[PDB]
Each structure stands twice: as structure tokens, then as C-alpha cells.
Design a protein around this ligand. Structure first.
Ligand SMILES: Nc1ncnc2c1ncn2[C@@H]1O[C@H](COP(=O)(O)OP(=O)(O)OP(=O)(O)O)[C@@H](O)[C@H]1O
Ligand SMILES: [Mg+2]
Lengths: 434, 48
């Protein structure tokens, strides 16, 4: 069935958004923001007016998608009118962004028709000579994660960028993107004064009909590139119009928990791709049993699923450690006290099962630390940045120089949570109460 | 080691190997948990 292959491929690239530009899908709740971004970028590229605007919205809220759609829209009709410089706040640092701007400037100006050669002082003053200072070429700056350059110490790059926006003869468009709602408070006073205070907040999903209409936009094939298109559109419209269908129930569950269309797309894609024929795809979209299987797999390495993989000695040691941590006031325990509780519990069970020695319980203890059931007391864990991690790697911690049986640990799961989802018919269930 | 002791004293050989593996699992699953590598180590130490 090559027609099913064509329909499956079309549905898959609609779900990945990799359509041609004229066929790109804009959701109805995203349309006002898309028009506002289109007006700003058209006033920059067509009409040579300088602009400064920060896009504020959560992750996966189509900030990059709308900007890329607008730039590819103006790419096909005004190609020689503008160049694009892309900076990302994670990849680029305050010194490295100068070199990135210079290298993108030379490779973008060689694409239409050196600036990037020398030390950092020379490169920066050459960029300033080009920008600080027929039609003029617009320079569009796309600044992702712009909050990292609005720091508390100094904001040199944002100062010079907004100075180029407000006081230069080359027209420049600067788009910032961030997740921080209070991005204007991050800005220094002179940087905020040079900024235009134009902040666009990305639209959120307000009602369930927005999610259903977006799913309808994603899964309806609007071109007749397969013979199965009409039946697929009919069955999809039948499932979406029915309020009691399984797909509507999954959309409602997403609206109540995640409220994220990329989250739903990540489940819809293997439902579409794992089907082998047209009727199998129709049964899959009518039942959505694969969505249940996917949801079960997404939770299988959580705290609930990791406990169900434990052995009887592992579960007994974990219960004993949770008992010792509950009785403690700092919630702290070690291997010796947990082994004392374990041997007490085994004696009171066999008085009313093999007792293992401390040498063999050492391995189960190490596995429980490895599976993130226990953690070291007041441990910071993974550091935020490379500098603090580098500082931590050059320090010898006091919990790594004492013997293992005296190291203080704290529970990632408490005894009440242990009682909740260990089954009532289990052997050690009675000792989850204290 | 196995063939050297058969000489010095094919489904049957698979039977005794699988029975050894099941005995190792039944003796040390509470010790190893579901660690494949720990049971591989115990099999390699206790086979000869
Ligand atoms: N150029 C693109 N073409 C097609 N789909 C894209 C493109 N850029 C992003 N997407 C898709 O858009 C969805 C999320 O939007 P996007 O990546 O724009 O989020 P964002 O709000 O800019 O994110 P962040 O704050 O993390 O940078 C995802 O499904 C992603 O795959
Ligand atoms: Mg982005």
C-alpha cells in the first residue's frame, strides 16, 4: 500500500511541522501573535525601520516557530533585503557573542554579494564601525535566551545592541526570546532606556476547543496526495466531533495536566508511525490504546515503577531505612542503624526468611543509593553551571573520607508513601506503619 | 573446564548450563536484584 505510505509520511511531516512554507500550519490561537510579529518584521525588512522587541513565553510555546515562519515567509520575496544573525544565550557568552556576530556577519554578507579577523578589541570595534557608525540591508538579530545577557553585573552587549537599534543608520531588528515574565526588571536602567519596551507575551491555550482545533489542524490532510485522504479526514472528523471519543478524552487529560500541544504530538507521532496499514491506523486513532501504552512507559522509571523492580531483600532494607528515618528528627540514618532495624524485623517475623549478613547487605545498600532511593545528607547534587561544578570537583567532601557505614543518608521516599503502594498481601507490609 | 572434566572422568550440556544459571538466580536474586552484571560476575566465579 504505497498510498498508506504517502498518507503516513504526510501525517508525520504535518506533526513535525516540516511542510513547505505556503503549507505551514498556524493555530487559530496563535494568529494574532503571528500577525504582530509579521508586522514588526515587515516594518524592519521592507520599510527599513529599526525595531526592538522581546518575545516572552514558556518553553515550547512557538516563539522560535513563529520567528522562523516569518523569516522564511520574507525569504521568498525579499531575499537580498536582509541578513540574519542568530545568538543563543546558552551557547554564546559575553565575549564569544562578539566573535559569533562577526563570523555570521561575514558569512551572511558573502551570501548576498575581514570583519571577523583580529583580537576581540579589534573585532568589536570593527563591528561597531559597521553598525554604530539603492536601499540599506536590514540586519535581523534573533536572540534566544536573552535573560542570560541581562545579568546583574554588566550588560555590555545589550547596551551596544539597543544603542544600534536606537542611534544608527543601518536598520536593525532585534528579537529577544525568553521564558522570564519579569524580563524588564532584569534590564539595567540605561539598557532599559535604550530599549523600546516592546514586549510580546505569547498566547496561552485558554479553552479545550483551542486544543481540539489545533489537533484538527495537525491531523487533517488538506492536499490530495494520497487516495486514503478523504476516509482519513472523515474518520478524524468523526472522532474529534464526538465528545465521548477516546481521542477527545486524551485531549481533555492533556488540557487538565500538561496543556501542551508538543506533549500531545510526542504521543501522536508513534501512534501514526507504528501503524502498518490504513485500517490499523483507523483502529489506532479510534481506540488510542497506544496513548495508554505510551503514558505507561513515560512513568515506568518514576519512584512508583522503580519500587516495583525491587527484590525482597532490597524492599526489606528500604523499609528498615524508612523506619529509622521516620523515627529520627533530622530524617537521617546510616547503614548500621538500618541493618539493626532489618535484623530486628527479620527476628520478629521469624519468631511470629533468611537473615543476610552486613557484608552482603552492603551490595543492596549500594544498589539502593544507585537507584536514587537514598541520597547523601545535605548534598547539593548537580550544580547549576560549569564554574560551581569545577569548584566542587576540587574539594574533598567529608562524606567521602569516612567509612560507608557511618555516612548520613536521607530518604527520597517516606514510609507513608511506601505503605500507600506496596500491596497489602506483601510479606513486609505490616512494618510500613510503625 | 567442563569439557576437560568430561574427557578426564549436546542438549544435555545446555540443560546443565541452564540449570546452573537458574540455580544461581534462585540463590542470589535477593543479593543482586535485577542486576544482569552482578549475576554475570557470580556465574563466572561459580561455574568452574
Ligand atoms: N523551524 C521549525 N520548524 C518546524 N517546527 C518547529 C520549528 N521550530 C520549532 N518547531 C516546533 O515548535 C514546537 C515548539 O515551538 P518552539 O520550538 O518555537 O518553542 P519556543 O517557545 O521558541 O521554545 P524555547 O523557549 O525552548 O526556545 C515544537 O513542536 C518544535 O518542534
Ligand atoms: Mg526557541
Amino acid at each position: 500500500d504505497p498510498g498508506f505510505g504517502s498518507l503516513q509520511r504526510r501525517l508525520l511531516q504535518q506533526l513535525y511541522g516540516t511542510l513547505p512554507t505556503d503549507e505551514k500550519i498556524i493555530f487559530t490561537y496563535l494568529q494574532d501573535c503571528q500577525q504582530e510579529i509579521d508586522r514588526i518584521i515587515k516594518q524592519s525588512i521592507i520599510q527599513k525601520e529599526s525595531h526592538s522587541v522581546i518575545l516572552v513565553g514558556p518553553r515550547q510555546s512557538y516563539k522560535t516557530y513563529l520567528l522562523d515562519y516569518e523569516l522564511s515567509l520574507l525569504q521568498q520575496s525579499y531575499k537580498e533585503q536582509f541578513i540574519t544573525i542568530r545568538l543563543n544565550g546558552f551557547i554564546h557568552s559575553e565575549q564569544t557573542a562578539i566573535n559569533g556576530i562577526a563570523t555570521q556577519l561575514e558569512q551572511q554578507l558573502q551570501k548576498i554579494h575581514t570583519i571577523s579577523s583580529g583580537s576581540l578589541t579589534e573585532v568589536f570595534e570593527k563591528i561597531l564601525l559597521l553598525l554604530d557608525s539603492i536601499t540599506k540591508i536590514t540586519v535581523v538579530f534573533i536572540f534566544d535566551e536573552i535573560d542570560t545577557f541581562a545579568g546583574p553585573v554588566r550588560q555590555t552587549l545589550l547596551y551596544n545592541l539597543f544603542d544600534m537599534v536606537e542611534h544608527s543608520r543601518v536598520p536593525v531588528c532585534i528579537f529577544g526570546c525568553t521564558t522570564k515574565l519579569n524580563i524588564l526588571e532584569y534590564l539595567e536602567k540605561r539598557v532599559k532606556s535604550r530599549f523600546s519596551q516592546r514586549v510580546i507575551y505569547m498566547p496561552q491555550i485558554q479553552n479545550l476547543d483551542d486544543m481540539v482545533d489545533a489537533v484538527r489542524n495537525l491531523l487533517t490532510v488538506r492536499s490530495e496526495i494520497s487516495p486514503w485522504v478523504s476516509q482519513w479526514n472523515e474518520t478524524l472528523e468523526k472522532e474529534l466531533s464526538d465528545p465521548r471519543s477516546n481521542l477527545n478524552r486524551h485531549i481533555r487529560m492533556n488540557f487538565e495536566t500538561f496543556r501542551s500541544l508538543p506533549t500531545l504530538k510526542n504521543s501522536i507521532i508513534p501512534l501514526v508511525a507504528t501503524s502498518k496499514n490504513f485500517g490499523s491506523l483507523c483502529t489506532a486513532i479510534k481506540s488510542c490504546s497506544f496513548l495508554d501504552i505510551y503514558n505507561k512507559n513515560q512513568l515506568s522509571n518514576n519512584l512508583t515503577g522503580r519500587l516495583q523492580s525491587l527484590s525482597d531483600l532490597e524492599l526489606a532494607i528500604l523499609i528498615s531505612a524508612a523506619r529509622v528515618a521516620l523515627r529520627a528528627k533530622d530524617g537521617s540514618f546510616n547503614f548500621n542503624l538500618a541493618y539493626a532495624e532489618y535484623e530486628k524485623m527479620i527476628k520478629a517475623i521469624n519468631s511470629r526468611i533468611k537473615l543476610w549478613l552486613k557484608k552482603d547487605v552492603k551490595n543492596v545498600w549500594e544498589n539502593l543509593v544507585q537507584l536514587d532511593f537514598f541520597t547523601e545528607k545535605s548534598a547539593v547534587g548537580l550544580r547549576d553551571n560549569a564554574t560551581a561544578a569545577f569548584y566542587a570537583s576540587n574539594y574533598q567532601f567529608q562524606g567521602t573520607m569516612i567509612p560507608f557505614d557511618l555516612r548520613s543518608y536521607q530518604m527520597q521516599i517516606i514510609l507513608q508513601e511506601l505503605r500507600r503502594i506496596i500491596p497489602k498481601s506483601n510479606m513486609y507490609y505490616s512494618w510500613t506503619q510503625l | 573446564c567442563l569439557r576437560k572434566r568430561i574427557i578426564e572422568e549436546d542438549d544435555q550440556f545446555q540443560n546443565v548450563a541452564a540449570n546452573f544459571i537458574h540455580l544461581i538466580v534462585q540463590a542470589f536474586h535477593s543479593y543482586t536484584g535485577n542486576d544482569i552484571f552482578a549475576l554475570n560476575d557470580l556465574i563466572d566465579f561459580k561455574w568452574p
